[model samples]
Target: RLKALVDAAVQPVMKANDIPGLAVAISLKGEPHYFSYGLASKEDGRRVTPETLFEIGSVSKTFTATLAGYALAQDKMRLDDRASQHWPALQGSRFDGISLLDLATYTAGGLPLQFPDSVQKDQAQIRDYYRQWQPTYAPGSQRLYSNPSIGLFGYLAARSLGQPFERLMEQQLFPALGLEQTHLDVPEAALAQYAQGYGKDDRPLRVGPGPLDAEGYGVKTSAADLLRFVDANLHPERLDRPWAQALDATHRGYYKVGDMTQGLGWEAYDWPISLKRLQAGNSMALQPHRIARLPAPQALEGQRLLNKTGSTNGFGAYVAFIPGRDLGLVILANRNYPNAERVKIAYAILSGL
Candidate 1:
């Protein structure tokens, strides 16, 4: 049984690596199979479930990118539009020539992986910092995989669509994509389903609220809901016209970093994808890595493979999909683990299928 294969890959890892809890779902032939392991809390002695919520970290980037795509399709904003158009507070800063697409693709003159200590988590402070900053390179010239860059992109997308980022994602997008257990904020009544996350020291871990939280790394979800999301992603054409366009837009590749083609919030490559390509995109490059001008890598072929990895303070999540193969997989763990480890586990199981 495929369950055996899943267990073989997951169980030992949980035991060998000492992961507290995990949830996984594999979608095959238009159907999904789910598996849960370990406890929501080691001290509480409760098992995790499909209803058990897990923080999806940067995996939330996919949602942010999709939101931008939706806004573009509805004409609420243009991908090539300037950043200050929606958020006027950004007026004459380093954002002069920065475009929404540049921010979405992590090429907005090189925002770093994080905001500076001066800016910290304050939204107003973030504006002040950017207002006085300078870019290391020209806009749309390279990829930096920055949270601040994409966070600002998502913030603009939300503002353009006339809704708060959290509200739009938790309310509209979730329902439209057929997700019930996935959330930016899990409600009070659903608290029982919230899984306990653990830090490296075996300490309890929860996301500390902050500005740009929703856009950067603030999503709490479940395996089942994420699987449904994966299902929706595979067949966006089956959706309403606007949503279909938005979904299609997100997969449009914008750059080529080494062997991988960079898509909004996701990375793409020709199928029979290789470990070499995967690692190249993940490698830490100090200098700007951009796909020199031209309309950013736009091949959304069905045979392409798309993937992303995300980690918050105490949780980790990985998702991969192959539209041509009619297959997708999501792995969510309460304990923060290595991205490469997550990739290895998912790859082992996926390659066999």
Candidate 2:
């Protein structure tokens, strides 16, 4: 009956989203369960496995935020510093007007959710765009969830450590987090285990190279690995002191808009949360909304939920966990799907249990 319960809860969402393949992993009070369905590659008859790597999209930001925290814990970086101080190319640019904390919490003026197409092809182009950029709002004035803004934050964090962002993440961060199958760039040998993503038109697709993609949304990881990350977040003591401290730091609230509390890379609400409330938080708008900058970062207390949503052109992922309940859920799919369906399915499964 327990097995059937998971199946009944998931099958309809997969059907509703037309997801070719997906994997789910849950950690309930530290016990883990894994489930997989459909094809990893629809044309090749490959099955989605617990180990199948899927593009995590902006869910990758959580990892970037952790890197920032790790750097901070080790005295490698300070969040209050101007962006231009860390990267010379940004020198004399408007980035000097913003602090790294502003970028990490999505309050750096108003960076677009994406880089313009003209700047997407080359890193130099991206730098040039930043060099001439202007903030749509005063720094720290509003909350505008954006990839480029956070991407620059990660880039500066890596610069503080004097290593390429991808190298630092793939070698130092992933290993430190005990994520064995996660990658900013999947290895050639792992190609067979990488699921093929499909687009809205049901055609095959995959993420391509782009500026700041590594910092912004370039994670490919397995359901099993993601669940392990959740466990790490819930039980930081199992990790090294610096890393554990960093993980915990990511949960501190930096800003507030309505009921949503923005953390480093995570967002939170009081637990016993409603699907409607979760939907409201995830329903971010492209336009800016003034947000209350916390006088100081505050750690949320007493029965709280934390989560992030991620997507590429052809893939979608969602993760949520409640530390008080010792519960975590990971939902990954090959086809980009509606965030509402993803949230509803995860809520149905977690709440039902």
Candidate 3:
């Protein structure tokens, strides 16, 4: 029944927009209701399947934050630990006063949303970028969605644990969760199976052909694997005690980001009609709309709802779950659709659920 609704709603949109191909998998109380439309790759003409991989972009931060929470549980680090303490290179820099928790919540003294042009060259350049970087906004005073800050948070988590974040995720987190195909980088064998990403114009683009080395927004995963992750987040008790506790911490609201409430790496919002429309030209109205709609206040209390959106230039994705209601959904698309549209669609589906 749910699959029929998804097909009825999504197929028309895909065909009208010439989306080429897309994959979506929904989970209700951790049970999957799968749906696929279009092709996985236009060039190869591969059929969209449950196993196709998609670039999840910033949703990677949730995994990074979960790892940090696990580290906190294992006594490897503390949420309040200063960034400068773990990365001496950041000492006396703008991020020096930033805490692990601040970075996790994207409230780390207003770091920019993307890597500075100076650091785009390589990982070494990225490290140096933070070393010389200074926070333009006072720490904890405001919220800015920054890749550098969140990436550094993941970096610090690895540093505190005395292992690189990627290694830790592959060797520890994935193995612990029994996730085999999920990875920061795609393996050679899986390359043929990986879904091709499409830009706004529906043209092929090389979005993430390798391991997303940057923790901020460089992870690739499949709907099946991501749903397993959703399950872990929704039902942590089924996981190891430490991992379950970490998942709990990730879902708890940590800061109020503008109008939306931000948890460790997740975002929460009110349900059923807190959303509003923008007036003709009120620029500020949009920001409040974001706060009121995306992370609605009512959704934050008692784990009513936890949601997050992920996107890259060629891909768009979202995950939303109501733990209290034992319901959740994971939507992944090959096209770079608007995040707002995806969020709106998600709520529309949840309304019926």
TM-score of 1: 0.95
The models' CA-based lDDT, in order, is: 0.83, 0.88, 0.71
Instruction: Give the residue spans of candidate 2 off by over 4 A.
Output: none
lDDT of 3 by residue, 1-353 (tens): 78667776677667655666667777776578777777779887898787888888778888888888788888989878888888777778766678887787666665677765555536567767777777666676666676776788888988998988889998898877767868777899888767888975667864643222457766678888888888888788898899988787787665554445677778766444333321111112222122222333232445356777777877777887777777777778887776655655566677767
Candidate 1: C-alpha lDDT? 0.83
lDDT of model number 2: 0.88
* 65-157 per-residue lDDT for model 2 (tens digits): 999989899888888899899989989899989999999987888898888888865768988988998998789888888888999999999
Better of 1 and 3 by lDDT: 1
Model 1 off-target regions past 4 Å? 283-287, 292-297
For candidate 1, give the lDDT of residue 170.
78
Instruction: State residue 319's C-alpha deviation in candidate 1, in Å.
Output: 0.4
Q: Which order, best to worst by TM-score?
A: 2, 1, 3
Off by over 4 Å in 3: 208-213, 274-303
Q: Which candidate is the best by TM-score?
A: 2
* C-alpha RMSD of candidate 3: 4.0
- Greater lDDT among 2 and 3 belongs to 2
